[PDB]
Amino acid sequence: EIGRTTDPVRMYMREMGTVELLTREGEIDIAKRIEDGINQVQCSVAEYPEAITYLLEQYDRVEAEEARLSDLITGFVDDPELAREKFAELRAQYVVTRDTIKATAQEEILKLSEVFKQFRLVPKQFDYLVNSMRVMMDRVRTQERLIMKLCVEQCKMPKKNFITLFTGNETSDTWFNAAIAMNKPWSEKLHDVSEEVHRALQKLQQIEEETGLTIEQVKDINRRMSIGEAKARRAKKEMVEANLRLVISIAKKYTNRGLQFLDLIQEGNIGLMKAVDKFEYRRGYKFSTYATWWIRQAITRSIADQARTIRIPVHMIETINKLNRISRQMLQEMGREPTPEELAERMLMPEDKIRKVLKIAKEPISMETPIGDDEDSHLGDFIEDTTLELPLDSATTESLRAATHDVLAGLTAREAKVLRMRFGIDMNTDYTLEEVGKQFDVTRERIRQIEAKALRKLRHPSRSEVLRSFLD
Amino acid sequence: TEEFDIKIALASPDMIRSWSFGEVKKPETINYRTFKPERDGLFCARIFGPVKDYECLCGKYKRLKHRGVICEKCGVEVTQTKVRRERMGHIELASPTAHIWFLKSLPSRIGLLLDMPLRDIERVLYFESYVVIEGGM
Amino acid sequence: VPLDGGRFATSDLNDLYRRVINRNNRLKRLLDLAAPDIIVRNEKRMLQEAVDALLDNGRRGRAITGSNKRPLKSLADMIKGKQGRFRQNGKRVDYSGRSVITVGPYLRLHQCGLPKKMALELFKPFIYGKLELRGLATTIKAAKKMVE
Amino acid sequence: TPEEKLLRAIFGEKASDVKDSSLRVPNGVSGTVIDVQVFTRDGVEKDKRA
Ligand SMILES: [Zn+2]
């Protein structure tokens, strides 16, 4: 069955035909989970109160213009008209909840956390919440790794019993008084590095004090949120792996446009993954009528951007396509063909841009195309290069240095010096005529006239007699 | 130039980063409206020298008193344009790739070194079957 | 290089480099986007097929050129022999000519005819040396006209 | 270049604002001119000869 096949088309086609197509009930049954896949995330973020501080001040930043009126909210679940009334009720409850934790010491923040779900969000303000709280686990997770890193990697602490007493706990003094009490060899050694492993675990308490909750609160929120998170990728992987046959049919009409067959179906999948991302079945419309747009869209957005050698933009590409759809109707109607005077009226352009759009389309030849008669020679042997310069002009500019080293040599000590200085002969960048004087100290009409009379002297023929022949 | 008396060998990923003067991270070649070479592309100007003899791309440094000063807008250095003929870039592959000469040439060096038949390595480069690494106990 | 007339005449190493940079730039997007594994396996095996058409094209499906129907010219096809090396085994050469031969039986054994129209174009730079050493022309541009 | 500029001020010649690319008969071929064709793109004014 693995029959020595090389071409990656057949190796991808059969590798896709394992899965079987979904029914009309499988889609909503699969999509039903994705809502639950996010539903365990949104509930898993409300009990982490650090999101509200970031966004509750976003309304203070909204009316004070430290943010916009759209990229924070998009309408509560089940703009200034509706946000101001309820967003205060975020604070209207906020002053209620935080006072019990200064019984129901935790339930009041629960009263707000249980109700924070009713404030819908946009993706821009969304990723920060999942990013910030997930950023905290970046640090405290290795802190527990740190406590292993010093306690057992230095003082031969038993890593089998301290784990359960300190797996995620991070806040007690279990191996500070309880473990050391047994008087084991690891016991007496731990107090040398006891404060370092405690100062290092002071950040975790500072961190949980930075959030107001505990690492048990911190961990499980960033532990459960990843629980309901992976439950979505198990679903999106399920719907994308089924409809991959859909992409091969859509992405076959665009086959011969300079973009290979495999570069198309790999460009559709990158779009189809977005369709399942943005799909919403409560409209009642089926999936194929929805993902067929995002797929056919991306397979053509890429042909416009990355199929030409000399890249032309995506707004200009639409004009050339609009100029062939209309240059065909003029063909099969007028019979003979249209003219760039007559396309000015069929289209509505100023008749001078249409003469610029015409010569933009043509793509470059290849320098291996065998010339006419298919001789033993290619087109790459007949294009000469023009950066070079004739060895007779290179033999002239080396002869100009000989004369000017002479014709200037007939002048005085400094009346030649200004000529090498005011011009750029035999030096770096030339200087200013008042800058020239900064070597002579006399910056005036004398120096700016010394050059003229002096270079007028060379104008007296039989001195510039040789130099006259270098013009043409 | 000094007299030369010639070697050959494989090249490491840390030597190929030494010939190169910059990374090529976009497929665009030229501009299609003005024909100045676009930035980061294959025919770049910040990477493979300037296009015109002794001048930047924008046009700030056209003179010859500036002989080495790399521009500040676009970091072209004002030198001769034959330096567009001795420089190289490098693409940074997102995942390794078996050099075909040392895999498919008749006695496969990747093959007879690891002691694996060439039909069994071609089955692993195509993601058709795993291969154990450090089986352990 | 831009041909005369508005159309460009590229090599065919710009099609194989512009295809390694696309399938490699899309493989970075597909990994920071967290695609299913059935897709980023079709990108790794599709990337390294474009890199193995770059170095030596033909030991696989022979990825034919775009906008045409003949196979592209990989890097190992410029070095690879045309019956001669790329360097000197071919050297077209300056200072040369060619023409039809005839008999001329008045010659010695160590001479040959040579037209005045080839002796004046083969030996041009030797002439600009005499026309300035003998003092007839003044500069080397003024001598370029007397030979015309 | 610098020397070409000093050679200007000594003779004050005006700069050339256009490069000459005329059509010229090939080398070593000589004979009468028996015809002439002049094509003009639709939109430019014909010269006096065309
Ligand atoms: Zn610049």
Curated annotation (Swiss-Prot), chain D:
The free-text biotechnology note states: Co-administration of salinamide and rifampicin or salinamide and myxopyronin suppresses the emergence of resistance to both antibiotics.
- Modified how: Acetylated on several lysine residues in the presence of glucose.
Highest taxon above the source species: Bacteria
TM regions (residue ranges): none
- What protein family is recorded? Belongs to the RNA polymerase beta chain family.
Its subunit composition reads: The RNAP catalytic core consists of 2 alpha, 1 beta, 1 beta' and 1 omega subunit. When a sigma factor is associated with the core the holoenzyme is formed, which can initiate transcription. The rRNA transcription and antitermination complex (rrnTAC) consists of RNAP, NusA, NusB, NusE (rpsJ), NusG, SubB, ribosomal protein S4, DNA and precursor rRNA; S4 is more flexible than other subunits. In pull-down experiments interacts with CedA. (Microbial infection) Interacts (via flap domain) with Escherichia phage lambda antitermination protein Q; this interaction renders bacterial RNAP resistant to transcription pausing and allows it to read through termination signals.
Function text: DNA-dependent RNA polymerase (RNAP) catalyzes the transcription of DNA into RNA using the four ribonucleoside triphosphates as substrates.
Q: What is this protein called?
A: DNA-directed RNA polymerase subunit beta
Lineage of the species this protein comes from = Bacteria, Pseudomonadati, Pseudomonadota, Gammaproteobacteria, Enterobacterales
Which residues of the whole protein are included?
Answer: 896 to 945 of 1342
